[PDB]
């Protein structure tokens, strides 16, 4: 499979940010709930 060059290339920095945003969107909401498991369990 051959391709033209990226029309809007994503530099390493851009990637680093994209990767950071992604991971965060997965880890923050879950971390919040999990961190507070006790606050819910105790009722």
């Amino acid at each position: 499979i051959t391709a033209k060059p990226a029309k809007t290339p994503t530099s390493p920095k851009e990637q680093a940010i994209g990767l950071s945003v992604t991971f965060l969107s997965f880890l923050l909401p879950a971390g919040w709930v999990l961190y507070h498991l006790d606050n819910y369990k105790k009722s």
Binding site: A3, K4, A6, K7, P9, T10, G18, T22, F26, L37
Partner: protein, 514 residues
């Protein structure tokens, strides 16, 4: 107009895309649920607090991955996108009905999500067996919401099966016989037949569970002369076919991938390959009771079911060996997709062999309901179905989008996932042999090590899926359009460019009747 195009579609491509989006989303829900499971088991003691929440989670995990991730992606997604393209058809036979098959899914999902929110949810296991699922042990709307989700999902797939079979049988070039359609197409036709015949029995079964809970019938209640075992028979009569329905489209994709990246015109033993899928499809309807070996059935019938279950290995063996024979002498391209396919071939073999161990009713007495079975099906599903889904995805992604993925990141992704899943499930074989039951939220201290390693493996896989989300972002963000594609002579789906126009085959292909 977003509406006319995305909500009122009658285009096999757009519908296929809608399925891939839905399935991607559902997979996140399912993955989250799988992590809460391992979180609870990652350390002795209890984390969630009440074990009913655990059970609710274990249940939802199963339904989401099976009904909302694997099937929509494999059949609804890759099915709709590729089937017409591989046989030169303008669209499916019933494009309007096809759109309903899709739209029945969000409602169906909603009802499943609703069941875990009202009351205490449905902590019944994905088998939802009565009496536990009855109106006494599970009073409230939960189980009923779960049953309805299943009805909608069933209706969706039955309607889908009718479409695929009609399409594949009626809409090929007049000169092309069934023995000239690519294996993926065969794989989705056979799967459609299995769905058509098995789903209605399930529907009958859960309708009976529903009337028992709400109309005072006693199909499964001994009080009225019913029998809880009757449920098991109906559920599993659907249930075994279902597991083969989850892997057949995968067998199809793996055949195309292995062939392509080996630089061959066709897979080895094409007809042996067709024969094998039909056989698996057929035998898959007469082995159900191997899920009921500790239920108390006559010894003679238990001997029959173990004997029958074992012959399924013969046709499966010819497939595994044909894939290897296809690689033989090939000019191998080590692409991400090829990597996923090689992993599938091996992992699936491990999971399948493990299933042969379990086919023995004598030995299943002590393995039944232990983590040994959880290990088996996670090898064939999490490393079978899923690995095919990933290979198929990276391979055809350029055809669906017109853009290419960053091949290196894709390989990184594979490497991580390969470690995560094995670390997660391999240990579980030990747990089972040594006696740890399934559906337990805690365990005797002796089983600590393996459960600990296992829960750790599960986080590795988490990293891999986050990573994957990024990989898709970068491809769309970078925008490297496709120029030329290899081997189009034996791979029709690519002939219309990437992505193919809204309407393909407006003028049919030309195939001589030599």
């Amino acid at each position: 107009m977003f509406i006319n195009r995305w909500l009122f579609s009658t285009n096999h491509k757009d519908i296929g895309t809608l399925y891939l989006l839905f399935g991607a989303w559902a997979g996140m829900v399912g993955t989250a649920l799988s992590l809460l499971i391992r979180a609870e088991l990652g350390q002795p003691g209890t984390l969630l607090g009440d074990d009913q929440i655990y059970n609710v989670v274990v249940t939802a995990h199963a339904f989401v991955m099976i009904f909302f991730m694997v099937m929509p992606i494999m059949i609804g997604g890759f099915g709709n996108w590729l089937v017409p393209l591989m046989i030169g058809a303008p669209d499916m036979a019933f494009p309007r009905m096809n759109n309903m098959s899709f739209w029945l899914l969000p409602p169906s999902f909603l009802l499943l999500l609703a069941s875990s929110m009202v009351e205490a949810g449905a902590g019944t296991g994905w088998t939802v067996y009565p009496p536990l699922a009855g109106n006494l042990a599970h009073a409230g709307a939960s189980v009923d919401l779960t049953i309805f989700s299943l009805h909608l999902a069933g209706v969706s797939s039955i309607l889908g099966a009718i479409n695929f079979i009609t399409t594949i049988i009626n809409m090929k070039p007049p000169a092309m016989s069934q023995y000239q359609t690519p294996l993926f197409v065969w794989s989705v036709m056979i799967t459609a037949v299995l769905l058509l015949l098995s789903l209605p029995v399930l529907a009958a079964g859960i309708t009976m569970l529903l009337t028992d809970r709400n109309l005072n019938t006693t199909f499964f209640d001994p009080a009225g002369g019913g029998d809880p075992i009757l449920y098991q028979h109906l559920f599993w009569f659907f249930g075994h076919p279902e597991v083969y329905i989850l892997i057949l489209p995968g067998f199809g994709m793996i055949s195309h991938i292995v062939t392509y990246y080996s630089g061959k015109k066709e897979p080895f033993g094409y007809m042996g390959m067709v024969w094998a899928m039909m056989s698996i499809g057929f035998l898959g309807f007469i082995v159900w009771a191997h899920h009921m070996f500790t239920v108390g059935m006559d010894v003679d019938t238990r001997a029959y079911f173990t004997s029958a279950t074992m012959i399924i290995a013969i046709p499966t063996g010819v497939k595994v060996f044909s894939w290897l024979a296809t690689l033989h002498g090939g000019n191998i391209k080590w692409s991400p997709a090829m990597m996923w396919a090689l992993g599938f071939i091996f992992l699936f073999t491990v999971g399948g062999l493990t299933g042969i161990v379990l086919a023995n009713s004598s030995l299943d007495i002590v393995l039944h309901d232990t983590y040994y079975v959880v290990a088996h099906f996670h090898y064939v599903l999490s490393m079978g179905a899923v690995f095919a889904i990933m290979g198929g995805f990276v391979h055809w992604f350029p055809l669906f989008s017109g853009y290419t993925l960053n091949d290196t990141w894709a390989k990184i992704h594979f490497a991580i996932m390969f470690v995560g899943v094995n670390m997660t499930f391999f240990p579980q074989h030990f747990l089972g042999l040594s006696g740890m039951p399934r559906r337990y939220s805690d365990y005797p201290d002796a089983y600590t090590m393996w459960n600990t390693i296992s829960s750790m493996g599960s986080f590795i896989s988490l990293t891999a899926v986050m990573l994957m989300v990024f990989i898709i972002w970068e491809a769309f963000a970078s925008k490297r359009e496709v120029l030329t594609v290899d081997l189009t002579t034996t791979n029709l789906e690519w002939l219309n460019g990437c992505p193919p126009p809204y309407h393909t085959f407006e003028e049919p292909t030309y195939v001589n009747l030599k």
